[PDB]
């Protein structure tokens, strides 16, 4: 009936993690990006971000009602207590999860990995990203497995800025030969407001406000008609 605040916070985190994994393993094909659980007085509203929304709701909201019902009967909420929505994501091109799923479903049919990886990289760059790198490791026929990597732009690896400037996605692709793991890293651009990128700039980047052209006479003289 009651548990301590440490246990409560840990349980909330576990609930978020398991919910995220559940609707990752269900509808990875539906362009699902991530979940966000919102607190509301005596309520738990859930927002799902996906690139494709007609396919997560489906016809007559079938998929939504089914998976809402199973989340209800799973996570111990009272009868009719869970209501999740499905809204599009404003940043589809530079979300790591979405691009990882895009690559995994470009590769699941059976296709050349270089063309798909370059297409994903080009699409992320044309989405305004500051830089990307895609690593695909696994079997390419033979007695040995190789890892080929596609980079373009500029990217950071160390320090704290990598926590809020780079988003990473690691996904497994199951082929008949075996499993190849893909890794999509996107370096978000700096943008105040809009939630497209982090608010703070790179801590090693110093800005100066730029003056304008000044070609003026020696002394100001008033002019009247």
């Amino acid at each position: 009936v009651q548990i301590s605040k440490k246990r409560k916070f840990v349980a909330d985190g576990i609930f978020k993690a398991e919910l995220n994994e559940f609707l990752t393993r269900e509808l990875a094909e539906d362009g699902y990006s991530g979940v966000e659980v919102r607190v509301t007085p005596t309520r738990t509203e859930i927002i799902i971000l996906a690139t494709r929304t007609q396919n997560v709701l489906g016809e007559k909201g079938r998929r939504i009602r089914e998976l809402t019902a199973v989340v209800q009967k799973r996570f111990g909420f009272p009868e009719g207590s869970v209501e999740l929505y499905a809204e599009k994501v404003a940043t589809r091109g530079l979300c790591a999860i979405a691009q990882a799923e895009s690559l995994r479903y470009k590769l699941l049919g059976g296709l050349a990995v270089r063309r798909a990886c370059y297409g994903v990289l080009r699409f992320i760059m044309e989405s305004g990203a500051k830089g990307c790198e895609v690593v695909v490791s696994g079997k390419l026929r033979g007695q040995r497995a190789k890892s080929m990597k596609f980079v373009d732009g500029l990217m950071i690896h160390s320090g704290d800025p990598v926590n809020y400037y780079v988003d990473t996605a690691v996904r497994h692709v199951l082929l008949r030969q075996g499993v190849l793991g893909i890794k999509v890293k996107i370096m978000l651009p700096w943008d105040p407001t809009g939630k497209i990128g982090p608010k703070k700039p790179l801590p090693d980047h110093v800005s100066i406000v730029e003056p304008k052209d000044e070609i003026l006479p020696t002394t100001p003289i008033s002019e009247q008609k």
């Binding site: 050349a112 990995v113 270089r114 063309r115 390419l140 026929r141 033979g142 190789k146 080929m148």
Partner: peptide, 30 residues
Amino acid sequence: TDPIDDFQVNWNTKHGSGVTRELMRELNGG
């Protein structure tokens, strides 16, 4: 099967010669 990818991967294996031939077919009338 990407002829360029096959060349970049295993040009230095038992199949390097045949992979080179498949690459030359994709590029020109080789």
